[PDB]
Design an enzyme around this catalytic site. Structure first.
Site, PDB file in Angstrom:
ATOM      1  N   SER A 126      12.628  58.350  65.935  1.00 24.00           N
ATOM      2  CA  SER A 126      13.010  59.658  66.802  1.00 24.00           C
ATOM      3  C   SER A 126      12.623  60.762  65.199  1.00 24.00           C
ATOM      4  O   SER A 126      12.680  61.827  65.659  1.00 24.00           O
ATOM      5  CB  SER A 126      14.722  59.597  65.945  1.00 24.00           C
ATOM      6  OG  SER A 126      15.272  59.753  66.952  1.00 24.00           O
TER       7      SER A 126
HETATM    8  C1  LIG Z   1      15.721  57.995  67.096  1.00 25.35           C
HETATM    9  O1  LIG Z   1      15.005  57.467  66.272  1.00 25.35           O
HETATM   10  C2  LIG Z   1      16.920  57.862  67.953  1.00 25.35           C
HETATM   11  N1  LIG Z   1      17.481  55.742  68.532  1.00 25.35           N
HETATM   12  C3  LIG Z   1      17.275  55.529  68.973  1.00 25.35           C
HETATM   13  O2  LIG Z   1      16.513  56.075  70.141  1.00 25.35           O
HETATM   14  C4  LIG Z   1      17.612  53.650  69.371  1.00 25.35           C
HETATM   15  C5  LIG Z   1      18.387  53.402  68.870  1.00 25.35           C
HETATM   16  C6  LIG Z   1      18.067  51.710  67.778  1.00 25.35           C
HETATM   17  C7  LIG Z   1      19.654  51.970  67.485  1.00 25.35           C
HETATM   18  C8  LIG Z   1      20.856  52.068  67.190  1.00 25.35           C
HETATM   19  C9  LIG Z   1      20.505  53.541  68.278  1.00 25.35           C
HETATM   20  C10 LIG Z   1      19.683  53.911  69.200  1.00 25.35           C
HETATM   21  C11 LIG Z   1      18.148  57.950  68.016  1.00 25.35           C
HETATM   22  N2  LIG Z   1      17.661  58.475  66.053  1.00 25.35           N
HETATM   23  C12 LIG Z   1      18.380  57.321  65.005  1.00 25.35           C
HETATM   24  C13 LIG Z   1      18.762  57.818  63.974  1.00 25.35           C
HETATM   25  O3  LIG Z   1      18.414  58.803  63.282  1.00 25.35           O
HETATM   26  O4  LIG Z   1      18.928  56.531  62.895  1.00 25.35           O
HETATM   27  C14 LIG Z   1      19.651  57.073  65.443  1.00 25.35           C
HETATM   28  C15 LIG Z   1      20.188  55.568  65.469  1.00 25.35           C
HETATM   29  C16 LIG Z   1      20.360  58.153  65.325  1.00 25.35           C
HETATM   30  S1  LIG Z   1      19.144  57.543  67.976  1.00 25.35           S
END
Ligand SMILES: *C(=O)[C@@H](NC(=O)Cc1ccccc1)[C@@H]1N[C@@H](C(=O)O)C(C)(C)S1
Ligand SMILES: [Cl-]
Ligand SMILES: [Cl-]
Length: 418
Positions: free
Chosen positions: A168
């Site tokens: 992300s």
């Molecule tokens: C960006 O990387 C997003 N991640 C996902 O969509 C995959 C995911 C993995 C584990 C749990 C939920 C979703 C979002 N950014 C991260 C982050 O900032 O750590 C999130 C887990 C908030 S989702």
């Protein structure tokens, strides 16, 4: 001839020589005095500096000690001299930052890359877990060596040079590309209902999913909340041509002038996505993106240089090299300002590192691997733009997030590098 030294940016030793009294075939330290290659930081910089070994028959095929791995091998010509003592090579590394960045992991698999974003100085390149480079160069038993090789976390690998899906954190680039393309309005309030979204039924059972319920969503809220649906929609709105046009201005497919072996970053496996799903996944850092932590820190340097990319450098006297206008100055400062909310908003993911006396922008990320999960943390010094951090924790589902261990490093950098 005495082998040349590898020193950090302040002259402190990283790969030096030291006389020991060994207990003639030297084994371990106590009888005869011998000169041994010594590494003051030990495992904190083992993968970067590497270790030396005795010259073998296969080495003499491509016509004392010789660098086996790391910078000891890459710089082996300049370091070994000729028997003219070897030359001293001064790095950009800061020993204090290198040791702090390594201490936060505590045997967790991961890596940390701390840079001077405006000059490219690699202040720290840490890979965890690690190994003892003094034993690898002067005497390690088969028991201790087999413990390294059988370690499933692979301590010999240099994780800062290994390509990963960015996660992300990559939304900062997708949002900046959307700003310059004119399709992403920062104040536009997008209606997003629920936790999953697809363009239509042709996507099948796949959806772009978010973690937080919120509507409407503008650019700043999407970054602080880390909304996958917002960026999947913005990526499809701009289209593959506008998306790749902005992506191609970064250093994808480009070999760097760093003495660290590194596969160039890639956008996808082919020149075309050939899939709306893959195009949307790439928008929020998944899909088939492969970017190393060093390459990530290089790409994210545009937000602290008004859109200019600053190439990384390891040798201190090397001239700074840049790539001008990778994104616009307005897009870089808009994204960087929005990332302040990740630290300053009490609901932000990086609020644990909030400092009322320091301006720190940040962006987190958790990548899903085909499963397992890796955690990422990018922080940007916005008070003086003197440091940038790219921190990663492998297998975050069991080892925790990068945000949960990186506060002592960020606290150290805010007081030292400022
Ligand atoms: C960006 O990387 C997003 N991640 C996902 O969509 C995959 C995911 C993995 C584990 C749990 C939920 C979703 C979002 N950014 C991260 C982050 O900032 O750590 C999130 C887990 C908030 S989702
Ligand atoms: Cl360099
Ligand atoms: Cl975040």
């Amino acid at each position: 001839a005495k082998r040349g030294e590898i020193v950090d940016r302040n002259g402190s030793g990283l790969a030096i020589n030291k006389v020991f009294d060994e207990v003639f075939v030297p084994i371990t330290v106590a009888t005869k005095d011998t000169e041994s290659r010594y590494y003051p930081l030990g495992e904190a910089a083992a993968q970067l500096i590497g270790y030396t070994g005795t010259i073998t028959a296969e080495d003499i095929e491509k016509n004392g000690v010789i660098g086996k791995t790391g910078l000891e091998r890459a710089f082996d010509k300049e370091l070994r001299g000729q028997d003219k003592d070897g030359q001293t090579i001064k790095l950009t590394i800061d020993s204090g930052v290198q040791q702090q960045a390594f201490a936060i992991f505590d045997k967790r698999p991961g890596s940390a890359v701390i840079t001077d974003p405006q000059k490219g100085d690699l202040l720290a390149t840490v890979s965890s877990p690690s190994y003892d480079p003094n034993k690898m160069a002067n005497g390690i038993s088969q028991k201790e060596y087999d413990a390294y090789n059988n370690n499933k976390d692979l301590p010999f690998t240099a994780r800062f040079a290994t390509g990963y899906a960015p996660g992300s954190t990559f939304k900062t680039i997708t949002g900046a590309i959307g700003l310059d393309a004119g399709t992403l309005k920062p104040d536009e309030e997008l209606e997003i209902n629920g936790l999953k979204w697809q363009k239509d039924k042709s996507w099948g059972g796949y959806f772009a999913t978010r973690v937080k319920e919120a509507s409407p969503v503008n650019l700043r809220t999407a970054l602080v909340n880390s909304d996958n649906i917002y960026f999947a929609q913005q990526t499809l709105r701009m289209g593959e041509d506008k998306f790749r046009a902005g992506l191609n201005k970064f250093i994808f497919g480009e070999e760097l002038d760093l003495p660290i072996a590194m596969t160039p970053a890639q956008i996808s496996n082919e020149d075309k996505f050939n899939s709306e799903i893959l195009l949307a996944d790439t928008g929020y850092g998944q899909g088939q993106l492969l970017i190393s932590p060093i390459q990530q820190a290089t790409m994210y340097s545009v937000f602290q240089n008004n859109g200019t990319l600053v190439y990384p450098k390891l040798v201190l006297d090397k001239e700074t090299k840049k790539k001008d206008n990778v994104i616009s100055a307005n897009a870089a400062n808009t994204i960087a300002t929005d990332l302040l909310g990740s630290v300053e908003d009490p609901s932000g993911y990086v609020y644990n590192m909030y400092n009322p006396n320091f301006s720190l922008a940040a962006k987190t990320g958790t990548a899903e691997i085909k499963g397992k999960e890796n955690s990422f943390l990018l922080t940007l010094d916005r008070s003086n733009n003197k440091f940038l951090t790219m921190i990663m924790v492998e297998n975050s589902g069991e080892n925790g997030s990068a945000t949960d261990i990186s506060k002592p490093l960020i606290d150290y950098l805010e007081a030292t590098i400022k």
